[PDB]
Chain A
């Protein structure tokens, strides 16, 4: 018979806030389960604060405007507090992970050879929090402990100790991931995608500490090391469940 799908499909054709909110929980769910502090989505959060400010003046103007149909106002109200909860929880989790890795972040700022900086990784408020938390913790341990110890042992960014002075994130921490494929619906532009047996395609990644290749079929959930899945998450191919 005649296959008519292409001509009918091409005959059928003859930034948005909801996608921003879905990306906001994508960032939140990827942030909560990750050991590494994820890069800051500056444009998304600036648009979200501008949108929540415009909604705040909108709901206050309608409150000045106050038939009595109060259910749209109730929709505005729980809309505002649920958005505030999501933003609050995301910033609180990333602030806790800033506090876990203060010494790592200040060495990463101190190393000019590394390409990662806090301007690309943290917000201005998070940069201020990390800096003044580092100074207040520094002052507390100088007037608490390190004043009474000699010149070799007051260093807190030390490396050559018997046990490592500086905290390091667990790069191989096991995490639940669910594959989404490419962010777009067009599958052929991904070079890493390859077709396998039984129709289902997969992503092939190599664990180097065992030197094994593993296949992640689209539509199934896994637990993997974070160093293996870091390059797929930065390209936004999986979701950290």
Chain B
């Protein structure tokens, strides 16, 4: 029933769905607030109290599919997180270049959220998009170098990483799982 390319791993659009199902800070451009003198929102998979209390030009916290849906309307503009600034990305780049053995303390959804906000929020960034995408590509490349260095330690027992992103888990999942499964199969056949 399940397709062969969705058998033992997630597709990247399922990762997009998973990271669309998080809260995010946002600026409404419409007023749905009841004054002292309109059907309610009434959702069942997220808290609708922050969406019922939606005030124009304020900071609220809504789920990301609502964020993208309202950005398509341009009724509400998505605010980038703290780590999507040039200074914080430069700090992450310096941490990557400082400790070669350890990955930086980036969020798990740092590639997928960046792609979503680049392709959907082209006028919602205080810093320019240009150097932001340059630093995103630099962090992606240095994380690729670190996972290429760490792949020399493919052990039969176990293998650990600290702060690898979910999209990088789907980058490296079938290769690592198949190679370690066959290494374990070789050693378990080697046991008496």
Interchain pairs with CB closer than 8 A, number: 107
Q: Is the CB of A17 within 8 A of B161?
A: no
Majority secondary structure, A binding face: helix
List the B side residues contacting A25 at CB < 8 Å: 18, 21
B45 interface residue, CB < 8 Å from A?
A: yes
List the A side residues contacting B73 at CB < 8 Å: 71
Q: Is the CB of A223 within 8 A of B159?
A: yes
**Bound Cα distance from A55 to B21, whole angstroms:** 19
Q: Is the CB of A72 within 8 A of B69?
A: no
The segment from A4-12, A104-112, A167-175, A188-196 that touches chain B is A167-175
**Distance in Å from the Cβ of B93 to the closest Cβ of chain A?**
22
A3 interface residue, CB < 8 Å from B?
A: no
- How many residues of B are counted as interface, with CB atoms below 8 angstroms from the partner's CB atoms? 47
Known: A18-B47, A69-B39, A223-B158. A75 touches B66 (CB 8 A): yes
Q: Is the CB of B8 within 8 A of A33?
A: yes
A225 interface residue, CB < 8 Å from B?
A: yes
Q: Mark A45-59, 1 if CB is under 8 A from B, else 0.
A: 000000100010010
Q: Mark A79-115, 1 if CB is under 8 A from B, else 0.
A: 1001101000100110110010000000000000000
Known: A175-B177, A209-B191. A78 touches B69 (CB 8 A): yes
* Besides A18-B45, A33-B9, A174-B181, 14 other A-B contacts (C-beta < 8 A): A25-B18, A51-B44, A62-B39, A72-B41, A73-B39, A78-B65, A95-B1, A174-B177, A176-B169, A210-B157, A221-B160, A222-B158, A222-B159, A223-B177
Q: Which residues of A contact B (CB under 8 A)?
A: 17-18, 21, 25, 29, 32-33, 51, 55, 58, 62, 67, 69, 71-76, 78-79, 82-83, 85, 89, 92-93, 95-96, 99, 170, 172-176, 207, 209-210, 212, 214, 220-225, 241
